[PDB]
């Protein structure tokens, strides 16, 4: 019995400090570590964590605690935890929480607050944090009653992890966590046993599949979750309907495990996925929400639209599902699969599109600074199926995204709707903490790098096996391209150079700087063999970038 | 897709697609184009006398049909006058869509008069609140309001319509009405079926969604197959009654001596159907010693005292049907369970107070309750306002044999009865509707008597007249032994009702009660009856309530 | 500092310190302790029949006394029923303090029924909205509400009072009533005095604060010394009238042929007093070719069409007195200025329509306006609701010789007239108050007739009866040439009023209008007169309005 008052594993207790109950609750959630920075208003929670199995990981900027937490969330499926103090401690999380929420990464931030009695006073540091976090979280609440302490924390994890996952924020007044409380821990409740979409609705879609000549699956976030993996593969092998994924579902299906994969859609306007979508007469969306890929960019409207997710569709001018299958995805796809009478025979246009994609991929640039394509090829060599890849935001993101089919990484964190900079390095540290035995490669620009570079100290301190690569152009290039194209002049996109090798070494990490085109691969190969934090500076010639951005939406 | 001349045209066409039969409200310049467009549609315009009542009437339509009732008002005070109505609908789970006018998009930046931030005002009391700032999204936003209102656990939705958007041209199409989820997994149902078999004191706790029309047959199938006892929240008051099910333990929420609470505390297995903790605080009934099963259209809203061991989200009707098909045997009632229900029978026999015609003038509450039971049969809808009478009716709710009873009122809003009845009557005009309120609540919505007369609505409104706010006075009496701001003057309610062109009645004798009510029932149209009441016995009734 | 037994005691003591004479509202359990505590105070309890009207009555008290009127309601619907009232008070600059009950502090976290986020709901329509979460801050928060409401440009304030805070004990003291700023700098005043001397077409634009009682004498001193022409917003409608000042150019805001607008466009110097752009959109009058001077208690709320060349913030009364002392000479009117005012005189002579007794039945609007002017003298307060009659009265506002006129209504809220009058009467009971509304607006607040009868309030309410929402119908007629949702049924308003125990009247003849009104005036207590009106001539009047 979960709600029992006589459970030995989860006893009702007269807690000395609210903080103790909080930490006990976190343990029940299966939290392995917490990221953040302490302060007086929250120090008791940090203190209570000393008496628990949960590991404390001090970061150097709170924003990065949110980033690290998201990486943990995306991989484990259990919410990563950020822990900060009140005022600037909380407000420094807001971008991170927005980044986590938009990508569907489960994150729970516990933020300190002034005492309840000091909230009404015009005192400093009494931010309405709940109001500030609400627009960028699924869940935002302040614990005003000590009795609700365990309840609110449990609800935060539930909001973050269940449904379409997202970030959750909890404000903890100082007097509440320091003062005594009566209550018990709430055991963690898994995903609710939800039903498949209605049978009459499933057979209705099955009929459309048979009568369709260019069907295609559009995969969204929820399609990439583990509990849907087996059901998804079963449906694809039974139907052989082609597939294309959003970047939030980039890892849901690979070309190696499915022949009729049409790549990822979201950035480029000339992907096999897009052509098939425009060509489509029937599009079945799985685990997809319009935010992942604007329907205005791919939905011609000429195709019948089917919606399959754990939530109902949020209808809009370019997204009005003709059929709506709401319920457990795995159960829906399983039922749907049992009603596939025959495998799809591809249309000549459909088959040609997939043929063009493979052939193009099956394809010597000693120019200095390094050509982007040279750097991408070098990255592919060192990043294998035992290596996790994290990608920051910038022009390099587009280059890597363009050749994402040829990367053979275990997992790739690249999806970034908010287009937040500085995410790569913290993502890698978070990813490494989940799988320390494996290596993680992070890549950013010089701009994004310096926004989160302070966590290099955290990496050295953790002995994190992370290799960070920097595409150095000494400017904000992805912005400059747009300015050049629109105004034929630049504004505020140029800055000075740095000795990134010596910079990395001042942290106690291994530094590298590619001073020649021929030294690219040897340097990366060497930096990989380092058992610990390493940074590589890679000068890049972005002169060809305007050609690449023309392939975008 | 069509090139619409006015946004208002697209709005009305969308409403038509939603199956809207009528709209309630009051026009203004900022929204008059929508009113104008309704002239060219099958949709009926029903002018009210106060916007708050448009929301109330809309809720009544929503609760019955399951399709959102529609309120239509102008900007500024037109919108702000809806807020109490919208909050009442939302808390009761009544689907309502309010379309509210707004100043032109260009005048929102100027900060001119009548430019309320209505969306901010409506957000705390609605599922959905939005302003249409892009004409292209006009049809999308309206459809989304109906979906938000009608789907999941239903609620109220608000849409702000700038004048220039509804007046100006727009390109777009109507969105066909669409939600329908499948029953729970077989592996989940067999898991619950196993718990029922191994359980010795099972009990169903019925919440809002268990009372929906689409779940009635499936619910009856499960009760007849399992014979597990039942207790309901007041939001599910009409899901099961004492007369149609033998092991009914009454409704829980108000009284401290209900069979349902005793059975819940006794339970070793509690299956909640369509229930959310907000309907009845788990701190009052959940001992935690029982296995807790959750069946609803949404995942459970977990609380410190509500952590379900099993969680079934999906179609309720399909889930309950399947569950019934896997019940191996009917429940054999435990001695303690049977004793509790036996005690309830004796309790029901004691509350009836066999014989003892109460001769008191002013009329004794129980006398009025008995008189109401006589006139309200299975072909009559009953709507109940808020006050002391609410407690009396709620207590003898087991003995009412009404078609439908609208009484659930978490916000405890007064003045809801009459507008509810007008809304309820409009759904089934051929039938009679009885509304009952106090003198306080009556005058807060009495302006709709003219609307009832205009509609020839077959509504009989009863007034418990004490010339005061009694339900407050009693609480003051027990706490302070003195009254403050609970007394006001008398009125000639007969002439008052007749000034509207409705039939007026006044009970001037205890023996004249039933003849008057019967006479008022035989009126084919609006009729009002004033009933003087002696609330001196109320402290005896309030003692049966939860200290709270 | 004292150890209070109940927070409610401290609240009432604070109210006493604020000089509150009465409170309007309706009690409930969550707030009944404050009602109870008012029994032990000099403060009078005035139960209303709908909370919205408590806010309206409170505003009337505020506008007159300058001290905030007080509304007192319970939680949930008690609070949400105030929102329209509070928005109306705030937009008109009426000081109002609403004390609203709330659930216990412990039940706010549980998310239980009746736990509205009232502060979020009231914020968009108040100067000040706060919930008392710390009992120590109880007296501080109440005082701050009054200060927010009364100081600066006045407005409405809301305070949420959790049940346990007002019921539980508290330690604290009362805060004495405190704001008073000094006149503008001498160097600033001499600067303006210089501009007036060098100007050839100066004009005063009077806004809200110019109409406050404390500024009356100082304003009159400045006008008699300068003889600069004057035009007022409707919020300053009663600051100066045509009868008491020769160079009055009427009120600007509604009509497209006012002397004020012409003089403003002609102006080479515009001195705004107590004015904010919200009162009258600068896009309608500010050509920009004139030097602009700003005199108010706050810095100017600058806008694209309102960037004052000179800015005087401070005590208005002291500023205007000093300014007058530095006017070297009276204005010699320009030929264009004199022509405009001459045109206004001919206009006033044309609107009067010399002779021509209008014999029409139903009664012609101008006939009713003439009849109202006869009965409303300088000892009578006039309150005006919203509708077509509002336009008629507003147009002939120059010919009204009333003590005070409450007509300004930016939100254009209906049903304000009667509650305003009850509130106004309570400040000066020995005097008569006349309220006028339409049949639509009447029934939205008609429930307070019982309250008027209970108070023996000497109020005469007039109803322009057309059995419809006429002001909307006209706009529909011009735009669509057809009507929608603007028609409803008739009523016997005489018997309706009499059912309250008030005096009822019905004008059944054009010749019987004045005798009836005179008879109703002679009634010492509540009286209602129904006046059938022929609005067929209205399109002629609406043509005099700004296209808008
Ligand atoms: C926190 C922040 N600030 C600015 C930006 C702008 N930005 C990018 C972006 O998202 C856009 F420009 P858009 O509005 O078009 O979506 S990408 C980017 C990276 C440039 O610096 P870098 O890291 O050195 O990368 P490269 O020089 O190799 O291109 C910036 C600054 C943002 N995303 N986030
Ligand atoms: C809009 C509004 N205002 C006030 C009330 C307070 N009230 C009742 C109520 O809900 C409580 F007292 P609480 O939440 O604290 O339990 S019930 C009621 C009705 C009294 O007037 P009446 O209609 O004549 O009923 P009786 O005299 O026959 O008892 C009031 C005013 C509220 N609920 N809503
Ligand atoms: C709470 C409420 N509801 C509706 C209205 C609309 N209305 C008027 C109004 O303000 C406009 F039309 P707008 O802002 O667009 O100019 S005036 C009015 C009164 C009509 O009914 P009545 O009282 O009988 O007056 P007459 O028939 O004599 O003209 C209405 C309903 C509103 N202001 N407030
Ligand atoms: Mg949010
Ligand atoms: Mg760069
Ligand atoms: Mg229903
Ligand atoms: Mg909301
Ligand atoms: Mg009563
Ligand atoms: Mg004043
Ligand atoms: Mg505000
Ligand atoms: Mg009218």
Curated annotation (Swiss-Prot), chain A:
It is an enzyme of class 2 (transferase). Keywords: FAD, Flavoprotein, Magnesium, Metal-binding, Thiamine pyrophosphate, Transferase. Mg(2+) binds at residue 446. The keyword Transferase applies. It holds the Pfam family TPP_enzyme_N. One of its GO terms (molecular function) is acetolactate synthase activity. Its EC number is 2.2.1.6. GO terms for biological process: butanediol metabolic process; isoleucine biosynthetic process; L-valine biosynthetic process. Pathway: Polyol metabolism; (R,R)-butane-2,3-diol biosynthesis; (R,R)-butane-2,3-diol from pyruvate: step 1/3. It catalyses: 2 pyruvate + H(+) = (2S)-2-acetolactate + CO2. The keyword Flavoprotein applies. FAD binds at residues 164, 268-289, 309-328. Optimum pH is 6. GO terms for cellular component: acetolactate synthase complex. Belongs to the TPP enzyme family. Does not seem to require thiamine pyrophosphate. This is Acetolactate synthase, catabolic. It comes from Klebsiella pneumoniae. The gene is budB.
């Amino acid at each position: 019995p979960r709600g029992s008052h006589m459970d030995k594993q989860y006893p009702v207790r007269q807690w000395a400090h609210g903080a103790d109950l909080v930490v006990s609750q976190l343990e029940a959630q299966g939290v392995r570590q917490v990221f953040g920075i302490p302060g007086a208003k929250i120090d008791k929670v940090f203190d209570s964590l000393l008496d628990s199995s949960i590991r404390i990981i001090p970061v150097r900027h709170e924003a990065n605690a949110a980033f690290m937490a998201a990486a943990v969330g995306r991989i484990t499926g259990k919410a990563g935890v950020a822990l900060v103090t009140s005022g600037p401690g909380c407000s420094n999380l807001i971008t991170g929480m927005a980044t986590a929420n938009s990508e569907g990464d489960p994150v729970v931030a516990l933020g300190g607050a002034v005492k309840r009695a000091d909230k009404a006073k015009q005192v400093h540091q009494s931010m309405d944090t709940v109001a500030m976090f609400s627009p960028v979280t699924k869940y935002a609440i302040e614990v005003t009653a000590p009795d609700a302490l365990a309840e609110v924390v449990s609800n935060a994890f539930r909001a973050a992890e269940q449904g379409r996952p997202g970030s959750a924020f909890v404000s903890l007044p100082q007097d509440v966590v320091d003062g005594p409380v009566s209550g018990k821990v709430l055991p963690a409740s898994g995903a609710p046993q939800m039903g498949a979409a209605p049978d009459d609705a499933i057979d209705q879609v099955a009929k459309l599949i048979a009568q369709a000549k260019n069907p295609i699956f559009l995969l969204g976030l929820m399609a990439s979750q583990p509990e849907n993996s087996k059901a998804l593969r079963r449906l694809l092998e039974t139907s052989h309907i082609p597939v294309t994924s959003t970047y939030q579902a980039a890892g849901a299906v690979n070309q190696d495990n499915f022949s009729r994969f049409a790549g990822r859609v979201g950035l480029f306007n000339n992907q096999a996925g897009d052509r098939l979508l425009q060509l489509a007469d029937l599009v079945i969306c799985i685990g997809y929400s319009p935010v992942e890929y604007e329907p205005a960019m791919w939905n011609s409207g000429n195709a019948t639209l089917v919606h399959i997710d754990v939530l109902p569709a949020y209808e809009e001018r370019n997204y009005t599902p003709d059929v709506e299958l709401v319920g457990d995805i795995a159960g829906t796809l399983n039922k749907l699969a049992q009603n596939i009478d025959h495998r799809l025979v591809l249309s000549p246009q459909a088959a040609e599109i997939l043929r063009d994609r493979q052939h193009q991929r099956e394809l010597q640039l000693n120019q200095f600074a390094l050509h982007p394509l040279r750097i991408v090829r070098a990255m592919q060599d060192i990043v294998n199926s035992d290596v996790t890849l994290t990608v920051d935001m910038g022009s390099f993101h587009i280059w890597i995204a363009r050749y994402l089919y040829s990367f053979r990484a275990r997992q790739v964190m690249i999806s970034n709707g908010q287009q937040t900079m500085g995410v790569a390095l913290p993502w890698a540290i978070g990813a490494w903490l989940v799988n320390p035995e494996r290596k993680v490669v992070s890549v950013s620009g010089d701009g994004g790098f310096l926004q989160s570079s302070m966590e290099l100290e955290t990496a050295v301190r953790l002995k994190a096996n992370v290799l960070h690569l920097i595409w150095v152009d000494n400017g904000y290039n992805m912005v400059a391209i747009q300015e050049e194209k629109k105004y034929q002049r630049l504004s505020g996109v140029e800055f000075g150079p740095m000795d990134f090798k010596a910079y990395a070494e001042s942290f106690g990490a291994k530094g590298f700087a590619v001073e020649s085109a021929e030294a690219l691969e040897p340097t990366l190969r060497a930096a990989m063999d380092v058992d610990g934090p390493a940074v590589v500076a890679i000068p890049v010639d972005y002169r060809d970038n305007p050609l690449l951005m023309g392939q975008l939406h």
